[PDB]
Protein backbone atom coordinates (compact mmCIF):
# COMPACT_ATOMS: atom_id res chain seq x y z
CA UNK A 1 0.00 0.00 0.00
CA UNK A 2 0.86 3.70 0.19
CA UNK A 3 2.17 5.30 3.36
CA UNK A 4 2.89 8.56 5.08
CA UNK A 5 5.12 9.93 7.79
CA UNK A 6 3.96 13.04 9.56
CA UNK A 7 5.16 15.20 12.37
CA UNK A 8 2.62 17.34 14.23
CA UNK A 9 3.86 20.31 16.28
CA UNK A 10 1.65 22.33 18.60
CA UNK A 11 2.72 25.42 20.54
CA UNK A 12 0.22 27.03 22.89
CA UNK A 13 0.72 30.27 24.82
CA UNK A 14 -0.85 30.71 28.25
CA UNK A 15 -0.03 34.15 29.65
CA UNK A 16 0.21 34.11 33.44
CA UNK A 17 0.71 30.35 33.49
CA UNK A 18 4.31 30.11 32.38
CA UNK A 19 5.82 29.82 28.94
CA UNK A 20 4.06 28.29 25.97
CA UNK A 21 3.71 24.51 25.97
CA UNK A 22 5.28 22.68 23.02
CA UNK A 23 4.20 19.22 21.95
CA UNK A 24 5.58 17.16 19.08
CA UNK A 25 4.20 13.81 17.91
CA UNK A 26 5.24 11.65 14.99
CA UNK A 27 3.07 9.23 13.01
CA UNK A 28 3.46 6.61 10.32
CA UNK A 29 -0.01 6.42 8.78
CA UNK A 30 -2.40 6.11 11.74
CA UNK A 31 0.28 4.82 14.12
CA UNK A 32 1.85 7.23 16.61
CA UNK A 33 5.51 6.35 17.17
CA UNK A 34 7.10 9.23 19.11
CA UNK A 35 6.04 11.97 21.50
CA UNK A 36 7.53 15.03 23.19
CA UNK A 37 5.89 17.35 25.72
CA UNK A 38 7.75 20.36 27.19
CA UNK A 39 5.51 20.09 30.29
CA UNK A 40 6.82 16.60 31.05
CA UNK A 41 8.86 16.22 34.24
CA UNK A 42 11.90 15.31 32.15
CA UNK A 43 11.21 16.36 28.56
CA UNK A 44 12.45 13.78 26.10
CA UNK A 45 11.35 12.49 22.79
CA UNK A 46 9.96 9.13 23.80
CA UNK A 47 8.94 5.97 21.87
CA UNK A 48 5.26 5.12 21.39
CA UNK A 49 5.54 2.08 19.07
CA UNK A 50 7.61 -1.04 19.69
CA UNK A 51 9.44 -0.91 16.35
CA UNK A 52 11.04 2.50 17.12
CA UNK A 53 12.49 1.26 20.41
CA UNK A 54 15.40 -0.40 18.61
CA UNK A 55 16.77 2.99 17.55
CA UNK A 56 19.91 3.71 19.51
CA UNK A 57 20.78 6.44 22.00
CA UNK A 58 22.11 8.70 19.27
CA UNK A 59 18.64 8.68 17.69
CA UNK A 60 16.90 9.65 20.95
CA UNK A 61 19.53 12.29 21.68
CA UNK A 62 19.02 13.94 18.27
CA UNK A 63 15.22 13.84 18.36
CA UNK A 64 15.20 15.24 21.88
CA UNK A 65 17.65 18.01 21.00
CA UNK A 66 15.46 19.05 18.02
CA UNK A 67 12.37 19.13 20.25
CA UNK A 68 14.10 21.10 22.96
CA UNK A 69 15.29 23.62 20.41
CA UNK A 70 11.80 23.89 18.93
CA UNK A 71 10.33 24.42 22.39
CA UNK A 72 12.42 27.60 22.52
CA UNK A 73 12.06 28.69 18.95
CA UNK A 74 8.28 28.15 18.73
CA UNK A 75 8.02 30.51 21.70
CA UNK A 76 9.86 33.11 19.62
CA UNK A 77 7.58 32.34 16.71
CA UNK A 78 4.47 32.84 18.86
CA UNK A 79 5.84 36.26 20.00
CA UNK A 80 6.46 37.13 16.33
CA UNK A 81 2.97 36.06 15.26
CA UNK A 82 1.38 38.04 18.09
CA UNK A 83 3.09 41.10 16.72
CA UNK A 84 2.20 40.31 13.11
CA UNK A 85 -1.49 40.49 14.09
CA UNK A 86 -1.12 43.39 16.56
CA UNK A 87 -2.38 41.17 19.31
CA UNK A 88 -2.39 41.76 23.06
CA UNK A 89 -0.01 39.94 25.38
CA UNK A 90 -3.07 38.93 27.39
CA UNK A 91 -4.47 36.36 25.03
CA UNK A 92 -3.72 32.68 24.46
CA UNK A 93 -2.76 31.60 20.94
CA UNK A 94 -1.88 28.41 19.12
CA UNK A 95 0.69 27.65 16.40
CA UNK A 96 0.48 24.29 14.63
CA UNK A 97 2.76 22.69 12.06
CA UNK A 98 2.28 19.49 9.99
CA UNK A 99 5.02 18.13 7.79
CA UNK A 100 6.23 14.96 6.17
CA UNK A 101 6.20 12.74 3.14
CA UNK A 102 4.03 10.23 1.29
CA UNK A 103 5.35 7.18 -0.60
CA UNK A 104 3.72 4.59 -2.79
CA UNK A 105 3.97 0.79 -2.76
CA UNK A 106 7.47 0.95 -4.27
CA UNK A 107 8.72 3.24 -1.51
CA UNK A 108 9.13 6.16 -3.88
CA UNK A 109 8.15 9.72 -3.03
CA UNK A 110 4.61 10.66 -4.00
CA UNK A 111 4.78 14.17 -2.50
CA UNK A 112 6.00 16.20 0.49
CA UNK A 113 4.15 18.49 2.91
CA UNK A 114 4.90 21.36 5.24
CA UNK A 115 2.12 23.56 6.43
CA UNK A 116 1.10 25.65 9.39
CA UNK A 117 -1.89 27.23 11.10
CA UNK A 118 -2.29 30.02 13.61
CA UNK A 119 -5.28 29.92 15.96
CA UNK A 120 -6.71 27.16 13.78
CA UNK A 121 -6.58 29.17 10.56
CA UNK A 122 -4.32 28.23 7.68
CA UNK A 123 -1.22 30.41 7.79
CA UNK A 124 1.43 29.26 5.32
CA UNK A 125 2.04 26.13 3.25
CA UNK A 126 4.82 24.80 1.14
CA UNK A 127 3.52 24.16 -2.36
CA UNK A 128 3.67 20.70 -3.91
CA UNK A 129 6.66 21.91 -5.98
CA UNK A 130 8.66 22.12 -2.71
CA UNK A 131 10.01 25.39 -4.07
CA UNK A 132 7.50 28.09 -3.15
CA UNK A 133 4.88 29.01 -0.55
CA UNK A 134 1.29 29.99 -0.31
CA UNK A 135 0.79 32.65 2.39
CA UNK A 136 -2.71 33.17 3.72
CA UNK A 137 -2.47 36.89 4.51
CA UNK A 138 -0.10 39.82 4.91
CA UNK A 139 1.18 38.46 8.23
CA UNK A 140 2.15 35.15 6.70
CA UNK A 141 3.82 37.14 3.90
CA UNK A 142 6.36 38.32 6.52
CA UNK A 143 7.14 34.70 7.31
CA UNK A 144 7.26 33.89 3.58
CA UNK A 145 9.77 36.63 2.83
CA UNK A 146 11.89 35.60 5.81
CA UNK A 147 11.88 31.96 4.71
CA UNK A 148 12.57 32.87 1.09
CA UNK A 149 15.57 34.93 2.21
CA UNK A 150 16.90 31.95 4.19
CA UNK A 151 16.41 29.53 1.27
CA UNK A 152 14.06 27.45 3.40
CA UNK A 153 12.20 25.81 0.53
CA UNK A 154 15.42 24.29 -0.81
CA UNK A 155 16.20 22.84 2.61
CA UNK A 156 12.68 21.46 3.00
CA UNK A 157 12.90 19.90 -0.46
CA UNK A 158 16.18 18.21 0.51
CA UNK A 159 14.66 16.79 3.71
CA UNK A 160 11.38 15.72 2.13
CA UNK A 161 12.98 13.96 -0.86
CA UNK A 162 15.86 12.53 1.19
CA UNK A 163 15.88 11.84 4.92
CA UNK A 164 12.08 11.93 5.23
CA UNK A 165 11.53 9.08 2.75
CA UNK A 166 14.64 7.18 3.90
CA UNK A 167 13.45 7.12 7.50
CA UNK A 168 9.89 6.29 6.46
CA UNK A 169 11.15 3.29 4.42
CA UNK A 170 13.24 2.18 7.43
CA UNK A 171 10.28 2.44 9.78
CA UNK A 172 7.99 0.57 7.37
CA UNK A 173 10.48 -2.31 7.21
CA UNK A 174 11.23 -2.40 10.96
CA UNK A 175 7.51 -2.25 11.70
CA UNK A 176 6.32 -4.25 8.68
CA UNK A 177 4.27 -6.76 10.73
CA UNK A 178 1.94 -3.97 11.79
CA UNK A 179 2.52 -0.93 9.59
CA UNK A 180 2.20 -2.93 6.37
CA UNK A 181 -0.69 -5.05 7.64
CA UNK A 182 -4.21 -3.90 6.84
CA UNK A 183 -6.83 -5.35 9.17
CA UNK A 184 -10.23 -5.61 7.52
CA UNK A 185 -13.41 -4.36 9.19
CA UNK A 186 -15.62 -6.86 10.99
CA UNK A 187 -19.10 -5.98 9.71
CA UNK A 188 -22.75 -6.46 10.74
CA UNK A 189 -26.13 -4.75 10.42
CA UNK A 190 -28.31 -3.98 13.41
CA UNK A 191 -32.01 -3.03 13.46
CA UNK A 192 -33.47 -0.50 15.90
CA UNK A 193 -37.24 0.18 15.80
CA UNK A 194 -38.10 3.86 16.10
CA UNK A 195 -41.84 3.57 15.94
CA UNK A 196 -44.49 1.36 14.40
CA UNK A 197 -43.72 3.02 11.06
CA UNK A 198 -39.89 3.12 10.89
CA UNK A 199 -36.67 1.59 12.12
CA UNK A 200 -33.00 2.37 11.98
CA UNK A 201 -30.60 0.08 10.09
CA UNK A 202 -27.07 0.62 11.34
CA UNK A 203 -24.14 -0.79 9.34
CA UNK A 204 -21.07 -1.42 11.56
CA UNK A 205 -17.40 -1.69 10.77
CA UNK A 206 -15.10 -2.68 13.67
CA UNK A 207 -11.50 -3.61 14.29
CA UNK A 208 -10.04 -2.15 11.08
CA UNK A 209 -6.64 -0.59 10.36
CA UNK A 210 -5.78 1.84 8.81
CA UNK A 211 -8.60 4.28 9.51
CA UNK A 212 -9.48 5.04 5.86
CA UNK A 213 -12.76 3.28 5.01
CA UNK A 214 -15.84 3.81 2.88
CA UNK A 215 -19.17 2.88 4.40
CA UNK A 216 -22.38 3.60 2.44
CA UNK A 217 -26.04 2.62 2.20
CA UNK A 218 -27.99 2.10 -0.98
CA UNK A 219 -31.74 1.85 -1.51
CA UNK A 220 -32.68 -0.09 -4.62
CA UNK A 221 -29.06 0.37 -5.68
CA UNK A 222 -29.07 4.17 -5.32
CA UNK A 223 -26.68 5.79 -2.84
CA UNK A 224 -28.45 7.38 0.12
CA UNK A 225 -25.83 10.01 0.86
CA UNK A 226 -28.17 12.74 2.01
CA UNK A 227 -30.20 10.36 4.19
CA UNK A 228 -27.31 8.50 5.83
CA UNK A 229 -26.08 9.37 9.32
CA UNK A 230 -22.34 8.72 9.22
CA UNK A 231 -20.32 8.98 12.47
CA UNK A 232 -16.68 10.02 12.48
CA UNK A 233 -14.24 7.17 12.39
CA UNK A 234 -13.19 6.59 15.99
CA UNK A 235 -10.23 4.84 17.67
CA UNK A 236 -10.90 1.67 19.69
CA UNK A 237 -7.69 1.87 21.77
CA UNK A 238 -6.12 -1.32 20.40
CA UNK A 239 -4.69 0.39 17.23
CA UNK A 240 -7.94 -0.25 15.32
CA UNK A 241 -10.87 1.94 14.35
CA UNK A 242 -14.67 1.81 14.33
CA UNK A 243 -17.35 3.45 12.18
CA UNK A 244 -21.02 3.10 11.51
CA UNK A 245 -23.54 4.34 8.98
CA UNK A 246 -27.29 4.48 9.58
CA UNK A 247 -30.48 4.94 7.61
CA UNK A 248 -34.13 5.20 8.67
CA UNK A 249 -36.26 2.77 6.74
CA UNK A 250 -39.98 2.18 6.52
CA UNK A 251 -41.21 -0.95 8.28
CA UNK A 252 -41.08 -3.87 5.96
CA UNK A 253 -38.79 -2.28 3.35
CA UNK A 254 -35.54 -3.39 4.95
CA UNK A 255 -34.47 -5.72 2.15
CA UNK A 256 -34.40 -2.82 -0.28
CA UNK A 257 -31.34 -1.54 1.57
CA UNK A 258 -27.73 -2.64 1.20
CA UNK A 259 -24.62 -1.56 3.07
CA UNK A 260 -21.38 -1.37 1.15
CA UNK A 261 -17.92 -1.53 2.64
CA UNK A 262 -14.54 -0.75 1.10
CA UNK A 263 -11.29 -1.11 3.01
CA UNK A 264 -7.64 -2.01 2.15
CA UNK A 265 -7.79 -5.10 4.38
CA UNK A 266 -10.64 -6.70 2.40
CA UNK A 267 -10.04 -9.22 -0.42
CA UNK A 268 -13.01 -7.59 -2.10
CA UNK A 269 -15.68 -5.02 -1.19
CA UNK A 270 -18.54 -6.20 0.99
CA UNK A 271 -22.26 -5.88 0.48
CA UNK A 272 -24.37 -6.45 3.57
CA UNK A 273 -28.08 -6.56 4.49
CA UNK A 274 -30.17 -6.77 7.65
CA UNK A 275 -30.31 -10.48 8.48
CA UNK A 276 -33.15 -10.97 10.97
Amino acid sequence: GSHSMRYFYTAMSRPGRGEPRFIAVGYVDDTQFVRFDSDAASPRMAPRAPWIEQEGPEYWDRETQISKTNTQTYRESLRNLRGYYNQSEAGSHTLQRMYGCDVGPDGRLLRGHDQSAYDGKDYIALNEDLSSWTAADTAAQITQRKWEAAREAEQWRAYLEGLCVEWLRRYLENGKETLQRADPPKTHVTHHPISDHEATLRCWALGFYPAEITLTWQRDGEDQTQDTELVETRPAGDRTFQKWAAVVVPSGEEQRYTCHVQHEGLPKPLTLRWEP
Binding site: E63, A150, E152, Q155
Partner: peptide, 9 residues
Protein backbone atom coordinates in the same frame (compact mmCIF):
# COMPACT_ATOMS: atom_id res chain seq x y z
CA UNK B 1 13.12 11.27 12.11
CA UNK B 2 12.48 15.00 12.32
CA UNK B 3 13.83 17.78 10.21
CA UNK B 4 16.17 20.13 12.11
CA UNK B 5 15.25 23.59 13.28
CA UNK B 6 16.48 26.35 10.96
CA UNK B 7 14.07 29.34 10.90
CA UNK B 8 11.45 30.87 13.17
CA UNK B 9 8.16 32.31 11.75
Amino acid sequence: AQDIYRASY
